[PDB]
Design a protein around this ligand. Sequence first.
Ligand SMILES: C[N+](C)(C)CCOP(=O)(O)O
Ligand SMILES: [Ca+2]
Length: 111
Amino acid sequence: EDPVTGPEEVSGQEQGSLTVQCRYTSGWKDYKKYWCQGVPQRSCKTLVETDASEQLVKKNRVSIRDNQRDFIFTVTMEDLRMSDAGIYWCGITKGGLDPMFKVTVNIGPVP
Ligand SMILES: C[N+](C)(C)CCOP(=O)(O)O
Ligand SMILES: [Ca+2]
């Protein structure tokens, strides 16, 4: 089974926000969750990472919060710019190889 599942594709508009939900299998409750940007995959930049609780982490234009009742972590990116498009990953931090799931972001420009 896949430890982490999100949307393969998500869309946002410049100046708006977008929200990505990554579900994870229940056993990964007590592991830190993260949202990572760019390529190559194992060298992506971690934008935000939880502390393995339900507490919100917000850094720069990005927030993440883990719902450990329903096993879904929610990422929001606000005040979107065209440079926010591209490849991202929902991830779980563990010793050794992290579970990761690729999300591709499309951004449309202001008229
Ligand atoms: C994916 N990462 C950039 C957050 C860390 C490196 O990946 P991994 O070796 O822990 O799987
Ligand atoms: Ca790791």
